[PDB]
From Swiss-Prot:
Associates with the SH3 domain of NEDD9. Interacts with VIM and PLXNA3. Interacts with RAB1B, RAB8A, RAB10, RAB13 and RAB15 (in their GTP-bound forms); binding to RAB1B is of low affinity compared to other Rab proteins; at least in case of RAB8A and RAB10 can bind 2 molecules of the Rab proteins simultaneously. Interacts with STK38 and STK38L. Interacts with GRAF1/ARHGAP26, GRAF2/ARHGAP10, RAB8A, RAB8B and RAB10; may bind simultaneously to GRAFs and Rabs and connects GRAFs to Rabs. Does not interact with RAB1 and RAB11A. Residues 1-479 are annotated as: Monooxygenase domain. It is found in: Cytoplasm; Cytoplasm, Cytoskeleton; Endosome membrane; Midbody. This is [F-actin]-monooxygenase MICAL1. It comes from Mus musculus. Expressed in the postnatal and adult hippocampus; found in dentate gyrus, the polymorphic layer, cornu ammonis (CA) 1-3 and in mossy fibers of the striatum lucidum. In adult hippocampus strongly expressed in CA3 pyramidial neurons. Belongs to the Mical family. The chain holds residues 7 to 489 of 1048 of the full protein. The C-terminal coiled coil part contains the plexin-interacting region. The bivalent Mical/EHBP Rab binding (bMERB) domain, mediates binding to predominantly Rab8, Rab10, Rab13 and Rab15 (in their GTP-bound forms). FAD binds at C89, E108, K109, R110, R115, H116, N117, F175, Y283, D383. Monooxygenase that promotes depolymerization of F-actin by mediating oxidation of specific methionine residues on actin to form methionine-sulfoxide, resulting in actin filament disassembly and preventing repolymerization. In the absence of actin, it also functions as a NADPH oxidase producing H(2)O(2). Acts as a cytoskeletal regulator that connects NEDD9 to intermediate filaments. Also acts as a negative regulator of apoptosis via its interaction with STK38 and STK38L; acts by antagonizing STK38 and STK38L activation by MST1/STK4. It comes from the Eukaryota. The modification Phosphothreonine is found at T465.
């Protein structure tokens, strides 16, 4: 028996964060390496696992790692990064920073991956993930014509790649701000809760990537919010027994129908849209009008403030359950048989209401701060950059594009391009993000890489100039 093989194989199949971490530590012990140790550790792990279970994975990862943009792991070798958030986007960003050869530490306030809701994937992201070994880590990955994945499964497979690539991850620690350089010769550090170990507390970095999700409010960044017409989203997960009969039930990708009237007549349910993905669960997302929610007992009081309206006190869980099951049942014409709610992490029926009204996007995707001669590049990636409207399925795509554009920006930074040029180039790319679609991007997704010219047709990297981004560079002194 071979402990390294045993731990690698457990690591591959692990379905819980704690199991991924513990099997990875066992693997590191067996192979004479450390976790969080950069590409040198990746090289030592893979050299020692040239065998049936692992061979195909190293082939894929080495293929990506060999793309010219990474300069064989030397592009950012003097760059130190802190990534905030182990969501799909912060993990995807870290993988990229790791391939560039940067030192990558990532902090995440939670300690498990608990979300089961299902995310739509554009063709480029499906290729992207397959090319990182998704099939090895997740046997069900975008099989057939399926183009979606549950959040926690996406997190698990990206966590595994990040770990193999030597990203140093800390859990149960909340990024709360920055400790500015105290004097010349000092670097930037993070404010973290609760008190972290000497190494983390004193960890200095020149790049901060914030991928902390929709509710994180980035400091120094201007955020644009528009409150539109009230819209209330509801998501639900039902147990999928994966029977032959259940598989026949067609998905619903997304009133342009007589359907919504016939739904309203039969049930009293007034919807604007409904979506059904056949994933690890039978997952539904729908947008409901407030008046039918009040009428059907889902909402207790007609409160004018949306966050009170959709607050825990105003939502009746039993009525929300009847509402979601009745809509899902009607939408799929009963062909899923008797729907049973899947359980959330806490053991409750997995159904929830969300504010679909306000859409937020950062005014800029990056800033630079300098104090005492120490420069810090700050980048936003994922939901904290632009909040996705879930039914339209742009979340993973635009999060990953933001992750790529941030990493390219870090390559430019590492080249010594200087704060204003780095920001102007990044912002020229950012102007495109909310208009992106598969249709208007480069068609050859197999050739997508960090270089934005691989991804964005007829690229104007000067759409924004150095002079226009001056306010994004907070140079506090001349040191
Ligand atoms: C509860 C929930 C349900 C969702 N349901 C759907 C859905 O049904 N369909 C859909 O399309 N999209 C859904 N989304 C959005 C989808 O999950 C995201 O678009 C996708 O995961 C990419 O987001 P992200 O990685 O930028 O941020 P997130 O997935 O939000 O990840 C952010 C991470 O940062 C961590 N974090 C936050 N603050 C800090 C801090 N200060 N310090 C350290 N770590 C921090 C969080 O714990 C989290 O792990 C949902 C999101 C949530 C939060
Ligand atoms: Cl978990």
């Amino acid at each position: 028996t071979n402990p390294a093989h045993d731990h690698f194989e457990t690591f591959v199949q692990a379905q819980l964060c704690q199991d991924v971490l513990s099997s990875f530590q066992g693997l590191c012990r067996a192979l004479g390496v450390e976790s969080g140790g950069g590409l040198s550790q990746y090289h030592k792990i893979k050299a020692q696992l040239n065998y049936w279970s692992a061979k195909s994975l190293w082939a894929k990862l080495d293929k990506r790692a060999s793309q010219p943009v990474y300069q064989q792991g030397q592009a950012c070798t003097n760059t130190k990064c802190l990534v905030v958030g182990a969501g799909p986007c912060g993990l995807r960003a870290a993988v990229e920073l790791a391939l560039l050869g940067a030192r990558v530490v990532l902090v995440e306030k939670r300690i498990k991956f608990s979300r089961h809701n299902v995310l739509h994937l554009w063709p480029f992201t499906i290729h992207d993930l397959r090319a990182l070994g998704a099939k090895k880590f997740y046997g069900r990955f975008c099989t057939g014509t399926l183009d979606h994945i549950s959040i926690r499964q996406l997190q698990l497979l990206l966590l595994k790649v990040a770990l193999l690539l030597g990203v140093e991850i800390h859990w149960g620690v909340k990024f709360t701000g920055l400790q500015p350089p105290p004097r010349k010769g000092s670097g930037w550090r993070a404010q973290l809760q609760p008190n972290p170990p000497a190494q983390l507390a004193s960890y200095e970095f020149d790049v901060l990537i914030s991928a902390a999700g929709g509710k994180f409010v980035p400091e120094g960044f201007t955020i644009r919010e528009m409150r539109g017409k009230l819209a209330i989203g509801i998501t639900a997960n039902f147990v999928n027994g994966r029977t032959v009969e259940e598989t026949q039930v067609p998905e619903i990708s997304g009133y342009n129908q007589k359907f919504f009237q016939s739904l309203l007549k039969a049930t009293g349910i007034d919807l604007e849209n409904i979506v059904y993905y056949k994933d690890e669960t039978h997952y539904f997302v729908m947008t409901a009008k407030k008046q039918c929610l009040l009428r059907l007992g889902v909402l207790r009081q007609d409160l004018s403030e949306t966050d009170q309206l959709l607050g825990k006190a105003n939502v009746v869980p039993e009525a929300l359950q009847r509402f979601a099951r009745a809509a899902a049942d009607f939408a799929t014409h009963g062909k899923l048989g008797k729907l049973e709610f899947a359980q959330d992490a806490r053991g409750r029926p997995d159904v929830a209401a969300f504010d679909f009204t306000s859409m937020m996007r950062a005014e800029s995707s990056a800033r630079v701060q300098e104090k005492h001669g120490a420069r810090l590049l700050l980048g936003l990636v994922g939901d904290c950059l632009v909040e996705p409207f879930w039914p339209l399925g742009t979340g993973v795509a635009r999060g990953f594009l933001a992750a790529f554009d941030a990493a390219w920006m870090v390559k430019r930074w590492a080249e010594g391009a200087g704060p204003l040029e780095v920001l102007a180039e990044r912002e020229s790319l950012y102007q495109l993000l909310s208009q992106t679609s598969p249709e208007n991007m480069h068609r050859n997704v197999a050739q997508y890489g960090l270089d934005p010219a691989t991804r964005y047709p007829n690229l104007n990297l000067r759409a924004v100039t150095p002079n226009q981004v001056q306010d994004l560079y907070d140079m506090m002194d001349k040191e």
